[PDB]
Design a protein around this ligand. Structure first.
Ligand SMILES: *[C@@H]1O[C@H](CO[C@H]2O[C@@H](C)[C@@H](O)[C@@H](O)[C@@H]2O)[C@@H](O[C@H]2O[C@H](CO)[C@@H](O[C@@H]3O[C@H](CO[C@H]4O[C@H](CO)[C@@H](O)[C@H](O)[C@@H]4O[C@@H]4O[C@H](CO)[C@@H](O)[C@H](O)[C@H]4NC(C)=O)[C@@H](O)[C@H](O[C@H]4O[C@H](CO)[C@@H](O)[C@H](O)[C@@H]4O[C@@H]4O[C@H](CO)[C@@H](O)[C@H](O)[C@H]4NC(C)=O)[C@@H]3O)[C@H](O)[C@H]2NC(C)=O)[C@H](O)[C@H]1NC(C)=O
Ligand SMILES: *[C@H]1O[C@H](CO[C@H]2O[C@@H](C)[C@@H](O)[C@@H](O)[C@@H]2O)[C@@H](O[C@@H]2O[C@H](CO)[C@@H](O[C@@H]3O[C@H](CO[C@H]4O[C@H](CO)[C@@H](O)[C@H](O)[C@@H]4O[C@H]4O[C@H](CO)[C@@H](O[C@@H]5O[C@H](CO)[C@H](O)[C@H](O)[C@H]5O)[C@H](O)[C@H]4NC(C)=O)[C@@H](O)[C@H](O[C@@H]4O[C@H](CO)[C@@H](O)[C@H](O)[C@@H]4O)[C@@H]3O)[C@H](O)[C@H]2NC(C)=O)[C@H](O)[C@H]1NC(C)=O
Lengths: 210, 167, 212
C-alpha cells in the first residue's frame, strides 16, 4: 500500500435524472509528491477508452502533497443503463498506474410509490407539526426527495437514508416540519421525487387538510 | 589523569524499546590491564569490556551512563532515554543556534515499515515522503522553535510520534 | 495481507433493549482482530470508571479470507452503571504491539430527551395495493439509542423495518418504522401498535396503537 491513492466518485442523482443538468464522474488522486507532481489519467468506458477528460492541480491544506482530479462529463442515459467508468491514474511513484471503475448500481430498476401522510391528531397539540412523505419501492436507492409549500422549496425537512427491506427494494421517509398555524389555515405542501423509474424521472404528491 | 568518555553507537541517545544500543568507552588502559568500569546511575554493571551492549533496550536501560578504567578518571554521564511506542523523532540535538543544519529521522518500532510519512512542525506537515526516510535543513530560521513530530502508516494503522521541541 | 501493524481493537456498547429492561443482560464487547498466528495469545483488561473489573469472558476464532485470529471479550454491565455514565475501558495486550491498546466507551452525554411517538395510518392512495403501510414516528429523543417494535394482537409483527435515527434540527433524533400489512387486516380493523423503549420514558417504555 505505497504511492498515492485514487478515489472515483459517481455523478449526482439529480444531475443524472434531468438533461438540463450536467452529470460527471470524478477521479481524485491524493498524495502526489512535489518530487513528481505529475499524473496521467486513462478513462475507459465499458471497455472502450474515452478522451473527454479535464484536469487541474491543487496541492494544499496541511500537506506537502499534491491533489489531482479528472472530471469526465457523462451522457445521461449512459450511466443510467450502467457503464464501467474505469479510471487509470498514472504516476511514477506508482509501480503500475492505478485503475478503479464505478457505475450505476446493478439490478432491476423499480419505480417508487409516493404517499403523503398528514400529521396525526396527537401531534397537533404542539406548536409545530410533522408532515410525512413515504417513498417506498425503488431501485436503485439513488433518489431525490424535496418539499415545497408553494413554488418555493421548504427548509424545515429531513430525510432518512434509503432503507432496504423484505421486498428487496428501497424505501425512505421525509419529514417536513411546519408551524401548526400554517398547516391549520389549510395550506398546501408537496414532496417531489426524482427517480430513474418515474415517468419523467419525476413526480410529486401534495398534502392538505380535510 | 585524563577524563574518559562514553560514546553512543549510534549517535541516538533517544531510542525505542527494541533498539540495540552500544556504549563505546574511550580512554587509556594500563600495561597488564585492559578492563573497563561501567556505571548505570550509581549501580555498577559487571561486564569488563570497553563496550556495553544493549541488544533489545527496555525503558529500564534509560539513564545516565559512565565508564572508566585505571588510567582514565571517571567519565561524565551519558543520558540514555528509552521510549515506548510506534514512532520516535530523533536528532543529535534540538539546540540549534542561528545558523546550523537539522537532521530528523522518524524512527519506528523494530524499524517496522513506515509509509506516507510526514514530519510536522506545529500541526503543519513540513514535508511528506511516500516511504520513510529522513528530514533535512541547512541554516536556522529564527523560527524553527516549533514542536515537531512524525506520523505514518505502520501497515494499515496510523501511528504518531511524541512531539519534540527543536529550539 | 500485510499486517505489519499488529492487532486492532473495536469496543461496542450494549443494546438499548438490554440496558433498558432489568430482565435483560446489557453486555459490552471488546473485539481484537489481526491477531497473528505467531503472537496469538491475547490479554484483556477491563475497567469501569478506572477500577479494574475481573468478571469478563473470552473465546477464539479464525477467519478464512485473511487467515488471522479474531479474539473477543464480553463484559457484563449493570443497567445503572451504563445509564449513569461510568465509562468502560478495554485494554488489549499482545506481542505484536509496542504497548497495549486502550479503548473506552460510555453512554452518550447530553440532556436525555423523551421521545414523542405518533402512529400514521396507511395513505389513502395506498388502498390500490394488496398490502398497505402502517407508520410509527418517533421524534425528539436523545440519546439516539432507542428500540422500536410492532405488535398485532399481543404478539410480534414480523414484517416491519426501521429507518436508522436521524439528527434533527433542534439537535434531537427522530426515525420512522414501517409495518407492512395485508390490506384485508387493516380494513378488518385489527389493532396494531409500536412499542418504543428509550432511556427517557417513565418506565423506559411506552406504546401507541393504531387502527381505523
Ligand atoms: C482480517 O479479518 C478481519 C475480519 O474478517 C473479515 O470477515 C469477512 C466477512 C470479510 O468480508 C470482512 O467482513 C472482514 O474483514 C478484517 O476486518 C476486521 O477489521 C474491521 C475494520 O478494519 C472491523 O470492522 C469494524 O466494524 C465496526 C462495527 O462492527 C460491527 O459491525 C460490522 C459492520 O456493520 C460487522 O461486520 C461486525 O461483525 C461488527 O459486529 C458487531 O458486533 C457486536 C456484537 O454484539 C455488536 O455490538 C454489533 O451490533 C455488531 N454489528 C452487527 C454486525 O450487527 C465498525 O464500526 C468499524 O468502523 C470503525 O472504524 C473506522 C476506521 O477503522 C472509523 O472511522 C469508524 O468511525 C468506526 O469506528 C469508530 O467511529 C467513532 C466515531 O465515528 C470513533 O470515535 C472511533 O474511534 C472509531 N474507531 C476507530 C477505529 O477509529 C469497522 O468497520 C471488523 O470487526 C474486523 N472483521 C470482522 C471480524 O468483522 C481484517 O481487515 C482482515 N485483515 C487481515 C488481517 O488480513
Ligand atoms: C495529508 O492530508 C491530505 C490532504 O487531503 C485533505 O483531506 C481532507 C479530509 C482534509 O480534512 C485535510 O485533512 C486534507 O487537506 C490527505 O488526503 C486525504 O487522504 C485520505 C486518506 O489518506 C483520503 O481518504 C479517502 O477520502 C475519501 C473522500 O470521499 C469523499 O467524501 C468525503 C466525505 O467527507 C469528502 O471529504 C471528500 O472530499 C470526498 O469527495 C468530495 O469531493 C467529490 C469530488 O469528486 C464530490 O463528488 C463530486 O461532487 C461534484 C460537485 O461537488 C459533482 O457532483 C461530481 O459529479 C461528484 O463526483 C463528493 O461529493 C465530495 N464528498 C462529499 C459527499 O461531500 C473517502 O471516501 C475515503 O473513505 C474510505 O476509503 C477507504 C479506502 O478507499 C474505503 O475502504 C472506505 O470504505 C471509505 O470509502 C477515504 O477516506 C482523502 O480522500 C484525501 N483527501 C481528500 C481528497 O478528501 C493525505 O492522505 C494526508 N497525507 C498523509 C497520508 O499523511
Amino acid at each position: 500500500l505505497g504511492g498515492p491513492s485514487v478515489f472515483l466518485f459517481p455523478p449526482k442523482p439529480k444531475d443524472t435524472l434531468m438533461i438540463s443538468r450536467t452529470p460527471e464522474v470524478t477521479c481524485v488522486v491524493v498524495d502526489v509528491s512535489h518530487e513528481d507532481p505529475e499524473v496521467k489519467f486513462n478513462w475507459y468506458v465499458d471497455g472502450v477508452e474515452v478522451h473527454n477528460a479535464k484536469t487541474k492541480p491543487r496541492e494544499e491544506q496541511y500537506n506537502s502533497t499534491y491533489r489531482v482530479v479528472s472530471v469526465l462529463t457523462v451522457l445521461h442515459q449512459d450511466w443510467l443503463n450502467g457503464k464501467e467508468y474505469k479510471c487509470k491514474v498514472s504516476n511514477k511513484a506508482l509501480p503500475a498506474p492505478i485503475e478503479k471503475t464505478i457505475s450505476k448500481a446493478k439490478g432491476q430498476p423499480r419505480e417508487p410509490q409516493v404517499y403523503t401522510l398528514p400529521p396525526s391528531r396527537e401531534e397537533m397539540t404542539k406548536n409545530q407539526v410533522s408532515l410525512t412523505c413515504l417513498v417506498k419501492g425503488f431501485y436503485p436507492s439513488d433518489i431525490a426527495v424535496e418539499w415545497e409549500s408553494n413554488g418555493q422549496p421548504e427548509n424545515n425537512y429531513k430525510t432518512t437514508p434509503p432503507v432496504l427491506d423484505s421486498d428487496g427494494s428501497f424505501f425512505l421517509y421525509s419529514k417536513l416540519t411546519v408551524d401548526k398555524s400554517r398547516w391549520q389555515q389549510g395550506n398546501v405542501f408537496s414532496c417531489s421525487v426524482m427517480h430513474e423509474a418515474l415517468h419523467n424521472h419525476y413526480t410529486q404528491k401534495s398534502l392538505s387538510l380535510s | 589523569l585524563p577524563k574518559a568518555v562514553v560514546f553512543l553507537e549510534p549517535q541516538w541517545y533517544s531510542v525505542l524499546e527494541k533498539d540495540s544500543v552500544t556504549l563505546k568507552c574511550q580512554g587509556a588502559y594500563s600495561p597488564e590491564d585492559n578492563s573497563t568500569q561501567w556505571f548505570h546511575n550509581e549501580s555498577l554493571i559487571s561486564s569488563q569490556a570497553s563496550s556495553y551492549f544493549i541488544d533489545a533496550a527496555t525503558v529500564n536501560d534509560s539513564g545516565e551512563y559512565r565508564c572508566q578504567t585505571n588510567l582514565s578518571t571517571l567519565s561524565d554521564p551519558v543520558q540514555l532515554e528509552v521510549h515506548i511506542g510506534w514512532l520516535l523523532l530523533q536528532a543529535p540535538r534540538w539546540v540549534f543556534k542561528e545558523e546550523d543544519p537539522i537532521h530528523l529521522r522518524c524512527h519506528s518500532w523494530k524499524n517496522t515499515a513506515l509509509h506516507k510519512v510526514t514530519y510536522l512542525q506545529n500541526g503543519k506537515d513540513r514535508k511528506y515522503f511516500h516511504h520513510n526516510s529522513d528530514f533535512h535543513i541547512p541554516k536556522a530560521t529564527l523560527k524553527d522553535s516549533g514542536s515537531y513530530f512524525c506520523r505514518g502508516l505502520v501497515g494499515s494503522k496510523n501511528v504518531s510520534s511524541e512531539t519534540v521541541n527543536i529550539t
